[PDB]
Amino acid sequence: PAVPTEVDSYHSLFPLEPLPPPNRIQKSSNFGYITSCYKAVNSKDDLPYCLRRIHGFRLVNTKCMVLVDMWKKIQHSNIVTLREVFTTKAFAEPSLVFAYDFHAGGETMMSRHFNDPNADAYFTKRKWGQHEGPLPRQHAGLLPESLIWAYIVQLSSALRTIHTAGLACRVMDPTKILITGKTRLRVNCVGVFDVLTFDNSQNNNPLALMAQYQQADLISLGKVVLALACNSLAGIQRENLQKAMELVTINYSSDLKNLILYLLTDQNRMRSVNDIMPMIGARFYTQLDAAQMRNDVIEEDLAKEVQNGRLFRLLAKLGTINERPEFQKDPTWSETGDRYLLKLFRDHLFHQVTEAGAPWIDLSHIISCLNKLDAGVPEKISLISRDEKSVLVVTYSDLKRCFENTFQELIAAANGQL
Amino acid sequence: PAVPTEVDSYHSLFPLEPLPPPNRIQKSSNFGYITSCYKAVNSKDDLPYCLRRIHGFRLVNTKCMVLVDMWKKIQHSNIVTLREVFTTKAFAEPSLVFAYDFHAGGETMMSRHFNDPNADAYFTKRKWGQHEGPLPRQHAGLLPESLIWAYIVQLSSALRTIHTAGLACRVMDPTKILITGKTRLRVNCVGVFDVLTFDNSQNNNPLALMAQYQQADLISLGKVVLALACNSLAGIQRENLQKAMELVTINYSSDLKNLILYLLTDQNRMRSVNDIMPMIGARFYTQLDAAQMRNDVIEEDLAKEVQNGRLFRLLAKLGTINERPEFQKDPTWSETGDRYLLKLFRDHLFHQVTEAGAPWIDLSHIISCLNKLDAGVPEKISLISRDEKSVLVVTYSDLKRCFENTFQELIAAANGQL
Amino acid sequence: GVYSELHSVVAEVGVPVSVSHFDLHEEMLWVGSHGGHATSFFGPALERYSSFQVNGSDDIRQIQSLENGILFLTKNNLKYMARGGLIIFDYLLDENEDMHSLLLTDSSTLLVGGLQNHILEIDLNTVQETQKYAVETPGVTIMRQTNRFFFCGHTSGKVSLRDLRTFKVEHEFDAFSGSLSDFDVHGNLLAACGFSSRLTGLACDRFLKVYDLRMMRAITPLQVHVDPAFLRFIPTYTSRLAIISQSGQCQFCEPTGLANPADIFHVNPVGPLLMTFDVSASKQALAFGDSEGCVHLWTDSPEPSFNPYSRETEFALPCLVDSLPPLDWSQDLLPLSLIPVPLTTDTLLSDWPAANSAPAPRRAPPVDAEILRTMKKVGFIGYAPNPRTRLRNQIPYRLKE
């Protein structure tokens, strides 16, 4: 109730992240301002959108919308695509809200793989006058190198797409990647620095610093990948660069070695990501095969319940057809009318009881008769009234004819053709 | 009468291809012997299998079982996995049955693509003397280049995963590649020549000619993909090779022509799979992206249907709860009881009419209200009685609670627990 | 040649049988009561096949068995219906016509008549009256057809022989000065029984009026020891005349012989009154429907075939409840597809149009302030008078144009 639930088309807000208190003068260090995260639902399209709220920030210049348009034109599987950004005032302060979709179960790189201080303990520990023994070639907790390779593949593809679009992520930080499921990655906070550090000082040409931002992206990527290799952010420090290099030498392949060399030790040039494409080599296939096998599992699983929306909409039609008051007067639904069979059919389906008078309910029997009716099998079934005054044996196909005709009549009456 | 019912552990054998007549002395052109195809079911693990029967054979040397073991350890996505091999005499002749794991819906290269003779009529039946003018820029039958690049990716990955195990598929051919679905590929008839053409000529070393076999595999792959490019098997002919090259040059990509040149032209070296990798380039990621989009489709469909099934459970309860003669005695079914409200809810679900009173048939009202019901949403619902006297405001949570109690008491009574 | 009791059944308790008719295509028999409820029975085991109310008011007066279905006759309707109860067609007759008599001339043409002075010839497949023939003597309740003439029995006590094509009256017999109870035609002989008017009034005539079709004249009437309300020629060996009295006393006689009291047997001498009677085409079964709704079968064979060429009669299997695997309703996670599902290629029965298949948001509106104020809570129910500003289950959603 403290937060105004309604914002334009958005409703039913719920806080997602640990909310920074309104008295928290400490701005988030990732962007230099106070940020909060929530989820809402759009009334324009009935689609859910997570929202990111800034504090105390003012939309000064309008030129950024060109880049925001590029953000909206940019879509990718492993990116949390930018859909919209806007100003709000219903809150305690004028704020800027970024509306993305929500992906439940997203978990950051720290929370998934960097939540243990013991992973950092190797770098943080200092051997105080103690001989440094050989490092365990099987470091406890070491990830399969394939996972590292997969993460590299995803981030590299993201960088490729963004540079092809001619934009800069400037968000290469494990804090802004969510591992949906097991391997699927999601880069986060797209355009937030684009608006926060947006300036007009660059002679009304924002494209001046794009190459610098790209090189910063790649250097940050090298540091992140090294931290991934060390399963510890403490390795990316300049003091531990050589320790990280020797750990890479001890544990992982020359491919990863050359990677970190090529990146950490800059080539004093506008390095092209294409230059690193062959380096991954044959591991690409292992990745793609893994994906394909995941597909092969789920597609298989699909066939288990293909018929259920079918059969639900079946009983939906049943409910919208039976127990219609407007028909209780029509003699065509009386015991002398042709449609009394429908009433008797419903009574056999639901109202059938045991010989001892106990209620007789059997979902399997229900389903089986449903299957017979859906097939329209030439099997004949018997219909008995409550008092056994009148009994009729009829094939399922005539049931099909009667139900289709009655539903067609109801549709025509609903649509004004009667 | 030519198909025995039970062969070893397989029964229900159904011929899958038009079987050659018993008077067809002509050995199959693809395998050099009499061939037959059947679909059988395992009696042990109850699984579908495809049976390829070869005629007129007796085991010469048993060393081929090592190769068969190699295939039994080979598990690749795009390969028809070979399950077992055995000897049978239930047929008129002692025959060999290959049991592979079974997939439906396979359409071969020719069946999907080369089935159009006019696609071959470009290479064939030309003017043969009339001035051949400029080639039509849109050659009929041009495939999506993304699709053909995906096909070459799958083919190359299959070849490499085979070669790393020290074997040769040697069966790659248009007629021997099926297309499960639309793009996913499957290569059939694996591990056959290992026994069919099994000789101790190579010093009892089956791997003596592995390099020759793999280079022939590369050559045949090149021919296959050239046919794929031309939509005409006449293209792969030596006398149409130049026209195939020129058409591919006019139409498709430079990386594609260069790959064709590498694969087909003998480069006097043991050509390596790694060698072709850089020339596909970004198309690698483009394929992976398309795959992830298909993933995001299928998972969505699952998320629909499973929920619809859980809803069906509810509707079933509704069906067994409405209008029973025993509930006619049950005070809860009466108006003073809660279950009359369930009755009224049924009325609100199916008996909706317009402002003019005309019947309103629409799935969306029903589905939304039932989602509110099963979720037990705190959103209220005003239920106005049939006799139009009272309006009752009840939460969907309360409606769900009373309805669940109704159904569970009814089922307990029917089972006799009450 | 001696018919004895095989079985007796109750079509309807306390409601008289108003007409009965063996099905000539199957081992079936149809019994209609005066109250409008009809029931078919199978075999000597008298087993009920189908049972339902054919019409709410009009009693049933004739049942006709056809190859494709069953024709039911009431006072103001003609219903052609399937053996299982599906209505084939329903030809409503004029209320001004006391519909009584059917005549299946062939597979598709029916002659319908009664106390009215006209007989309607109707084509069944078209469900249309094709001809209307006038009758100078209304009251034709008995109708029979042989290879030579139409035999019309009139309530005036006459029998008219009419041409099979033009329907014009060719020959007439004044069998009785009062009323006609029954008449039958076989080969070269016609036997009629009925009521005549004497000084004491209208009473049943014990002298059967027997006419020779060969020489076209009445022959010596056959004096009987009962009150003949029905006559029927049984051609087992000779043309035995099954003389039926409503009191239950029935008799065998010869069409030209002498009535022998030793040929007198009793169906229901005490109690029920014989109302309806028929003989199987095989001459092996006899049915009497009485005034209590009871139908009695006498057979000269222990297990006769109602027709020597009788086709199979199908029976419906009961629901096979125990064969399916049990599924716990409280268990919402079990795979429901364990139930066998046969497949058919035709379009799914209930498929929905695109317009009615589109989902949308349907957020329910809040309560009216008026309702909130006037709503009094009683336990868990909300008791609030209807505002009367909406329709019954009017759409709570504002439909987009």
Tell me, letter by letter, the H, E, C secondary structure of B327-370. HHHCCCCCCCCCHHHHHHHHHHHHCCECCCCCECCCHHHHHHHH
- Which of B256, B188, B185 lies closest to B226 in space, CA to CA? B256
Nearest to A313 among C316, C321, C352 (CB): C352
Instruction: Look up residue B17 and give its two tokens.
Output: 């291809």
In the sheet with A10-15, reading across from the earlier edge strand, the strands are: A10-15, A35-42, A48-54, A95-100, A84-88
The verdict on a CB contact (< 8 Å) between A362 and C344 is no
Helix (H) or strand (E) holding A314: helix A308-321
Residues of chain C found within 8 Å of residue B400, distances taken between Cβ atoms? none
> What are B80's strand-pairing partners?
none
Q: How far apart are CA A239 and CA A245, in angstroms?
A: 11
Q: How far apart are CA C70 and CA C83, in angstroms?
A: 6
Q: How far apart are CA C278 and CA C297, in angstroms?
A: 10
Architecture per CATH, domain A308-415, reads as Orthogonal Bundle (1.10)
Q: How far apart are CA C357 and CA C36, in angstroms?
A: 44
The verdict on a CB contact (< 8 Å) between A368 and C337 is no
- Which of B237, B230, B233 lies closest to B139 in space, CA to CA? B230
Going through B121-271 in order, the beta strands assigned E by DSSP cover 177-179, 185-187
- Can you list the pairs that B93-96 forms with residues at least 24 positions away whose Cβ atoms lie under 8 Å? B93/B55, B93/B56, B94/B57, B94/B58, B95/B53, B95/B54, B95/B55, B95/B57, B96/B53, B96/B54, B96/B57, B96/B195
The domain locations on chain B are 10-281, 299-415
* B45 carries a ligand binding annotation: no
Q: How far apart are CA B390 and CA A255, in angstroms?
A: 77
Q: How far apart are CA C304 and CA C279, in angstroms?
A: 13
Return left, alpha or beta for B170; rule: phi > 0 is left, psi -120 to 50 is alpha, else beta.
left
Which letter, b or e, does each residue of A178-193 get, where b requires 16 or more Cβ atoms within 10 Å of its Cβ?
bbeeebbbbbbbbbbb
- Which of C290, C297, C301 lies closest to C268 in space, CA to CA? C290
Q: How far is CA B403 from the centre of its chain?
A: 43
- Can you list the pairs that C375-378 forms with residues at least 24 positions away whose Cβ atoms lie under 8 Å? C375/B391, C375/B393
Q: How far apart are CA B38 and CA B97, in angstroms?
A: 10
Nearest to B379 among C357, C364, C385 (CB): C364
The verdict on a CB contact (< 8 Å) between C393 and B364 is no
- Which of A322, A410, A304, A310 lies closest to A370 in space, CA to CA? A310
Residues of chain B found within 8 Å of residue A416, distances taken between Cβ atoms? 358
Q: How far apart are CA C107 and CA C216, in angstroms?
A: 31
- In degrees, rounded to 5, the angle at the alpha carbon of residue A363 between the alpha carbons of residues A358 and A364 is 115
- Which of C131, C133, C95, C101 lies closest to C117 in space, CA to CA? C133
* Residue B411: how many other CB atoms lie within 10 Å: 19
Q: How far apart are CA A319 and CA A312, in angstroms?
A: 11
* A52 carries a ligand binding annotation: yes
Q: How far apart are CA C13 and CA C9, in angstroms?
A: 10
Going through C17-148 in order, the beta strands assigned E by DSSP cover 17-23, 28-33, 37-42, 47-53, 62-65, 70-73, 77-81, 87-92, 99-101, 109-114, 118-123, 128-134, 140-145
Helix (H) or strand (E) holding C297: strand C294-299
Nearest to C386 among B353, B372, B389 (CB): B389
Top-level CATH class of B299-415? mainly alpha
Relative to beta strand C128-134, strand C118-123 is: antiparallel
Which letter, b or e, does each residue of C99-130 get, where b requires 16 or more Cβ atoms within 10 Å of its Cβ?
bbbbbbeeeeebbbbbebeebbbbebeeeeee
DSSP code of residue C261: G
List all residues of chain C from 357 to 396 with a beta carbon under 8 Å from chain B. 357-364, 366-367, 371, 375, 380-387, 391-396
Which letter, b or e, does each residue of B314-334 get, where b requires 16 or more Cβ atoms within 10 Å of its Cβ?
bbbbbbbbbbbeebeebebbe
DSSP code of residue C232: E
DSSP code of residue C59: P
Instruction: Look up residue B232 and give its two tokens.
Output: 């005409």
Helix (H) or strand (E) holding C159: strand C158-163
Q: Give the residue on A whose Cα is nearest the Cα of C353.
A: A411
- Which of B366, B354, A404, A218 lies closest to C393 in space, CA to CA? B354
On whether any CB of chain B is under 8 Å from the CB of C134, the answer is: no
CA C355 to each of CA A84, A186, B56, C225, C358: distance values in angstroms, whole numbers, following the listed order: 31, 37, 63, 79, 6
**Any residues with CB less than 8 A from the CB of C212 and at least 6 apart, and which?**
C188, C189, C219
List phi, psi (to 5°) of B39. -115, 125
Burial of B363 (0-12, 13-18, 19+ CB in 10 A): middle
Structure resolution in Å? 4.6
* Residue B50: how many other CB atoms lie within 10 Å: 21
Relative to beta strand A391-395, strand A95-100 is: unpaired
CA A138 to each of CA A113, A123, A131, A134, A250: distance values in angstroms, whole numbers, following the listed order: 17, 17, 20, 11, 9
Residues of chain C found within 8 Å of residue A407, distances taken between Cβ atoms? 350
Q: How far apart are CA B194 and CA B67, in angstroms?
A: 7
CA A100 to each of CA A49, A72, A162, C247: distance values in angstroms, whole numbers, following the listed order: 5, 10, 18, 95
Across the B:C interface, residue pairs with CB atoms under 8 Å apart total 101
List phi, psi (to 5°) of A363. -60, -35
> What are C341's strand-pairing partners?
none
CA A387 to each of CA A210, C41, C319: distance values in angstroms, whole numbers, following the listed order: 85, 19, 19
The verdict on a CB contact (< 8 Å) between A394 and C318 is no
Instruction: Look up residue A60 and give its two tokens.
Output: 């000064």
Determine contact, residues C62/C102, Cβ cutoff 8 Å.
yes
The verdict on a CB contact (< 8 Å) between A298 and B293 is no
**Any residues with CB less than 8 A from the CB of A407 and at least 6 apart, and which?**
A317, A321, C350
The verdict on a CB contact (< 8 Å) between C362 and B407 is no
* A81 carries a ligand binding annotation: no
Nearest to C337 among A46, A304, A336 (CB): A304
Instruction: Look up residue C205 and give its two tokens.
Output: 């005539």
Handedness of CA B12, B18, B23, B25 (dihedral sign): negative
CA C85 to each of CA A221, B197, C52, C53, C251: distance values in angstroms, whole numbers, following the listed order: 79, 70, 8, 10, 38
Q: How far apart are CA B338 and CA C125, in angstroms?
A: 53
CA A160 to each of CA A80, A191, A214, A275, B66: distance values in angstroms, whole numbers, following the listed order: 16, 17, 11, 12, 46
CA distance, residue B23 to nearest chain A CA (Å): 41
CATH of domain B10-281: 1.10.510.10
* B104 carries a ligand binding annotation: yes
* Residue C183: how many other CB atoms lie within 10 Å: 27
CA distance, residue C81 to nearest chain A CA (Å): 11
Q: How far apart are CA C181 and CA C277, in angstroms?
A: 12
Handedness of CA C320, C326, C330, C336 (dihedral sign): negative
Q: How far apart are CA B88 and CA B8, in angstroms?
A: 7
Report DSSP letters for A142-159, one per residue: PPPHHHHHHHHHHHHHHH
On whether any CB of chain A is under 8 Å from the CB of C336, the answer is: yes
The verdict on a CB contact (< 8 Å) between A289 and B77 is yes
Nearest to C329 among B351, B390, B411 (CB): B411
Handedness of CA C255, C259, C264, C268 (dihedral sign): positive
Structure determination technique employed: cryo-EM
The verdict on a CB contact (< 8 Å) between C324 and A368 is yes
Which letter, b or e, does each residue of A245-270 get, where b requires 16 or more Cβ atoms within 10 Å of its Cβ?
bebbeebbeeebeebbebbbeeeeee
Q: How far apart are CA B362 and CA B352, in angstroms?
A: 9
* A102 carries a ligand binding annotation: yes
Determine contact, residues B353/A416, Cβ cutoff 8 Å.
no
The verdict on a CB contact (< 8 Å) between A363 and C327 is yes
What angle, 0 to 180 degrees and rounded to 10, lies between the N-to-C axes of helices A308-321 and B283-321? 40
DSSP code of residue B21: P
Across the A:B interface, residue pairs with CB atoms under 8 Å apart total 149
Question: Position of tokens 């809150």?
Answer: A91
Helix (H) or strand (E) holding C211: strand C207-212
- Which of B190, B155, B211 lies closest to B72 in space, CA to CA? B190
CATH of domain A10-117+139-303: 1.10.510.10
Q: How far apart are CA A87 and CA A56, in angstroms?
A: 11
3-state secondary structure of B275: helix
